[PDB]
Each structure stands twice: as structure tokens, then as C-alpha cells.
Amino acid sequence: RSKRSKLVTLAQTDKKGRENKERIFDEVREALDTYRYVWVLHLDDVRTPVLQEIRTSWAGSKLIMGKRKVLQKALGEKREEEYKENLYQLSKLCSGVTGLLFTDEDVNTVKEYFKSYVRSDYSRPNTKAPLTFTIPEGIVYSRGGQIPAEEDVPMIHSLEPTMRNKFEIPTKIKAGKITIDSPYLVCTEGEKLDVRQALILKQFGIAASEFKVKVSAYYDNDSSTVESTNINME
């Protein structure tokens, strides 16, 4: 006895088994035969609308995501297990949340699109601060001074425990409004951000960082070679 009791939830969605991984495996190995260029994309902390817009833009091609280990196994772990000749380099260059782009379009066009593609994004932890944010003294508003307070709506009273405890911000409730005694500096521009500061910026709705897809390399079916692109790997 004396063991932890699992929480039970009555939801509609079940866990995926080995069949989903096998389906992804078969789809990757069929797309390898179907298409000509296989590109490796790094898409860490991507938003689903952004990913869907990228998929819509690359109509006629295929974008496959999933487990990095499953994708590498589909591409062939080593030289004696590779699905095609000189595929072990493409398999070993994968890292993190890796997407495989099977296409037939021009290499120059692919590079141009991935160099010129940029979207605004939330500032992630362990990144340089995009701006200096200071919550002004007095009543806290939803935007926190980004838009004028006459236009802005005051912060809802239900978020005061979250700002006091999780965000570690000294806040008080006066007449149902969140108030601070002094202006609160959150981040200084040109500083590595942590989880708390990233959460504060996300709560106030500041989206100043930029999301750019990283392109590792590509493999050509007929050439049987791999060339490093080194795009957005700065």
C-alpha cells in the first residue's frame, strides 16, 4: 500500500498507440519514393496557425512532423539500415522538433521562401529580450501601458492571485481593481528571459519577437547527396 493514486478524467480523446507511429513511418517512407527533395526544418515553439499557413503556402508538397526518433528510423539510423543511399547524414542532422518537407520545387525558390518568411511571436525563455517592459504605477490594465489606459480595459480581478503568486508581482485589490504601489520593471532590453518574465509578457500580450523557420539541409533523390543550407541558424 501507500502509493500515489492516479487522477481519472472522463474525456473524449484516447491516447495514440504504436499504430499512429507506424502510419507516420509508412507515410514518410512512401513520400521518400514519391518526391525528389527532402528538406529538414526546425520549428521549435511554432504556433499551429503559423504551421497551417506554411502548409497552405506549400501546396503540392508534403510536410510531416512527429517524433524525431520515428522520423530518423524512417530515414534510416545508419548506413546499413538507410532507406535510400546516403540518407544517414540527413537522418543524423535532425534535431528537436523536426519536420520533413518532401517536395519537387526549385531549391532557390525554397531557400527564398524560407529566408523571406517571418512572423511575430511571443518571446520565449532563454532568449534575448525584445524590449523593456515596465508596468506603470496605479491600476493595472490588460495591455499594461502598451495602448493608452483610456482605450484599455482594466485587468480582471480574477488574475490577481496569479500575478501575486505565480508572477511574483506585488499587487493589491482596491475596489475590484488590481493596483501596484510602484512601477514594476519586468525585463530589460538585451537580457536573457526566464519562464516568469516570458509568462508576464505573454499575459500582457506583447508579441515582439520574430519566428523564423530554421532550415538544416536537404537531400536530392537522383543526386544521392546532401547539402547544408544553414538558413536561420544564426
Partner: protein
């Protein structure tokens, strides 16, 4: 005071500063407390506690089914 004055007071002034943490810790202690009640209650109260535990378990299994 008139109407839902306690809810209005919560809306306008909040709760005690340690309310959420205290409630979370009490709900975390609940499993140990249930086991200690089952092993400590004697007589009629212990019999009623065991009966109610059985009824709750039957209800939970029926809900899962």
C-alpha cells in the same frame, strides 16, 4: 448587507492571501486523512465510514462504466 454580499465582497476585495495555497494543501492531505480516519474511527462511526466508502466506490465505478 443585501443580496449576494459575500460574493460582492470577494469580487471587490478578494480573499485571504494564503487561501489558494491552504486549500490546495488541505486537498493534498485529504488522502492521508481518509486513510487515518479509516484506521482510527471505532464503533458506529467506523462502521458508517466504511459503509459510505463502499457506496462512494460503487458510485464511482458506475460513473466510469
Amino acid at each position: 448587507p443585501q443580496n449576494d454580499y459575500i460574493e460582492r465582497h470577494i469580487k471587490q476585495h478578494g480573499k485571504r492571501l494564503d487561501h489558494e495555497e491552504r486549500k490546495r494543501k488541505r486537498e493534498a492531505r485529504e488522502s492521508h486523512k481518509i486513510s487515518e480516519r479509516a484506521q482510527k474511527l471505532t464503533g458506529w462511526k467506523g462502521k458508517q465510514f466504511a459503509k459510505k466508502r463502499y457506496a462512494e466506490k460503487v458510485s464511482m465505478r458506475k460513473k466510469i462504466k
